[PDB]
Structure 1
Amino acid sequence: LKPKSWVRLKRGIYKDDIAQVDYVEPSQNTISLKMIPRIDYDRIKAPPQRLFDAEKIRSLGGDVASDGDFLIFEGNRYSRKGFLFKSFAMSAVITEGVKPTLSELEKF
């Protein structure tokens, strides 16, 4: 596990997706991960990886809060500059065999 490295979430809607290791917690409990969201922006719920659209999720309304480039939506989901920056458990990700292809490297 290294800073700015890449892991993959074990479960969730982001399962098997490449996520950059944006920050490593000193306590070794969680890590902050950079991800391209897979969200319907609350339009379809009563999905492919897409850049986080702050204006779209603000227009849709519901559980949303912006500080600027940073946004909190849909139960503490953190996004910034079109990219999710969210903390995930070290047991909830796989830390080996992950390398970005060129597309993921361009993405992150």
Structure 2
Amino acid sequence: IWGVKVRLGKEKDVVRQILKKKLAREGTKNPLEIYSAFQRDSFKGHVYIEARKAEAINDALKGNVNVFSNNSKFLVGIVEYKDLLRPVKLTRGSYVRVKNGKFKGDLAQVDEVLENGLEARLKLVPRLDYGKDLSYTSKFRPAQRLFSEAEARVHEIRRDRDGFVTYGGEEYYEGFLYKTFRLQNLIVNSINPTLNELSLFDPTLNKTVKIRQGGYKGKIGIVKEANGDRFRVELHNPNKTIPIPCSFLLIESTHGWVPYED
């Protein structure tokens, strides 16, 4: 058995291509003298090929666009063969982490599994809004909080049993969502409970002004700053903001420019 380096993600394709070549050449004068070929997911970027002569390995891969042209094949020891073909949990009452949907990343208890053996019913702390803005994603979801049936009663619900309600077509029993997930959609290994899981389980600014005394008499402006007695008017006419005393200003109101009786 030789290993061969191939383009990442193209290992299954190379195994396929080798099979087509083998079957197409069976019984001809130039058979492909390989016995088998395979690719292990755990071993990214490699295909393994079974044969008697190295030349057959080169023959199997000739012209394959997914294989690195460098003469990189390597020999496997007989004592390493079976480990290449090693094929490899989940119990009711145990915890898993959800891998998809608004509950992605959340800890859940395994309640039960389907007869066929694919999806598992999970007990989950819900993330609900009680229909508050109706007329969901994992990035725009809700905080987790146990289902409250009286809140649902008040705001937006079918009773099914003691402590069991169907609310918006999902089932909540004693405050928890019970929802089926594909087993492939949950993580059962190396779960690390989090901290949180251990805990749980002046009236004239900006108004337009006219100046009635001084060298700037008759000009429009806006009150930029009115700290005290001395105002800052941003004059319109030249690009300058001036310091000015409060006796000098007329303010606009409902009827004309009004003195300091506004």
Alignment TM class, shorter chain as reference: 0.7 to 0.9
Q: Could you tell me which residue of structure 2 aligns to residue 60 of structure 1? A: 155
Q: How does 1:41-60 map to 2 (within 5 A)?
A: 41-46=130-135, 47-60=142-155
Q: Name the counterpart of 2:231.
A: none
After TM superposition, give the deviation of residue 17 of structure 1 in Å.
Answer: 0.4
Aligned residue type for 1:74: G
Cα deviations across residues 62-89 of structure 1 (Å, max 9, x unaligned)? xx211231111223x1111111122211
Q: Is the 8 A contact 1:6 1:100 kept in 2?
A: no
Aligned-residue CA RMSD (Å): 1.9
Change (3 A) 1:78 1:105: farther
Give the structure-1-normalised TM-score.
Answer: 0.82
In structure 2, the partner of 1:80 is 173
- Please say which structure displays the higher CA radius of gyration: 2
Per-residue CA deviations over 1:34-67 (Å, capped at 9, x if unaligned) read: 1110111111344111011011112222xx2112
Work out whether residues 36 and 83 of structure 1, in 8 Å CA contact, stay in contact via their aligned partners in 2.
Answer: yes
- How far the C-alpha of 1:26 sits from its partner, in A, is 3.5
Percent identity reads 38
1: distance between equivalents of 2:192 and 2:111? Answer: 15
Secondary structure at the counterpart of residue 33 of structure 1? strand
Q: Contact (CA 8 Å) 1:33, 1:87: kept in 2 or not?
A: yes
Structure 1 unaligned residues grouped into runs of 5+:
none
**Residue deviations 1:16-41, cap 9 Å, x none?**
10001122333212111111101111
Residue 4 (1) aligns with residue 93 (2): yes
Structure 2 length normalisation: TM-score?
0.37
Following the alignment from structure 2 to structure 1, what is the Cα–Cα distance between the partners of residues 198 and 134?
Answer: 31
In 2: Cα distance, 1:94 partner to 1:34 partner: 14
Q: Which residue among 83, 104, 108 is the counterpart of 1:15?
A: 104
In structure 2, the partner of 1:91 is 184
Q: Which amino acid aligns with 2:130?
A: Y
Partner of 2:212: none
Instruction: Name the structure, 1 or 2, with higher relative contact order (CA <8 Å, separation 6+).
Output: 1
Give the number of equivalent residue pairs: 105
Where in structure 2 are there 5+ consecutive unaligned residues? 1-89, 136-141, 202-262
